[PDB]
Structure 1
Amino acid sequence: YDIQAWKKQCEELLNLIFQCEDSEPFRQPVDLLEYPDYRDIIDTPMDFATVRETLEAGNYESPMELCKDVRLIFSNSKAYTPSKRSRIYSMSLRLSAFFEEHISSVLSDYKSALRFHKR
């Protein structure tokens, strides 16, 4: 019932994500010189270094907020891909499945801890 445990669990999950070769296109803010029309399609860019930095700054109040930003990395990739078979989009699909598999217990434990706190 540890209400704060999610933070270190998210730090460790981000470490696993950075070790994954599939995260390489998503580790840093997108390259506007390589994709000059990116901001025409994507309103809110997001990347894993920004998520990690926001976590480390103490600027997430809950793992649900972190999860919303990570899911935005994947929906941006889906919105920008010219094809559902593209290399970078295929990497985002695998990485999304890995992330969802690991974040589920983090969210469940946090929500359970908050319910216990307010019992």
Structure 2
Amino acid sequence: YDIQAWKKQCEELLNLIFQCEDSEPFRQPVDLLEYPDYRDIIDTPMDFATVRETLEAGNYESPMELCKDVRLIFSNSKAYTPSKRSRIYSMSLRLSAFFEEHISSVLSDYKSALRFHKR
């Protein structure tokens, strides 16, 4: 019932994600001028370094907010892929599965802790 525990759990999960080779495409923001069409497709860029920085700045209030940003990484990758014959999209789908399998308990524990606090 620790209301704050999600933060270190999310830091540890980001550490695992950064270690995963499947995160390579997503670790840093897209150079908009390198992939010049990117901002025509993607209204809100997101990447794992931004997520970590947001977390470390104390600018997430809940793991749900972090989750929303991580899921945006994946939706952006899907929106930008030209095909499934892309190593990047393939990596996004695997990393997404990994993230979702690991974030579920974080979310559950946090929401449980909040409920207990309000009981």
Shorter-chain TM-score category?
Answer: over 0.9
TM superposition shift of 1:32: 1.9
TM, length-normalised to structure 2: 0.98
In 1, Cα distance between equivalents of 2:34 and 2:90: 19
In 1, Cα distance between equivalents of 2:66 and 2:113: 17
In 2, Cα distance between equivalents of 1:85 and 1:113: 43
TM superposition shift of 1:105: 0.1
In 1, Cα distance between equivalents of 2:110 and 2:32: 37
In 2, Cα distance between equivalents of 1:5 and 1:74: 25
Aligned length: 119
In 2, Cα distance between equivalents of 1:33 and 1:21: 25
TM superposition shift of 1:97: 0.2
Identity rate of aligned residues, in percent?
100
Q: Deviations over 1:2-46 (max 9, x none)?
A: 000000000000000000000000000012233100000000000
| Structure 1 stretches lacking a partner, 5+ long | none
2:13 corresponds to 1:6: no
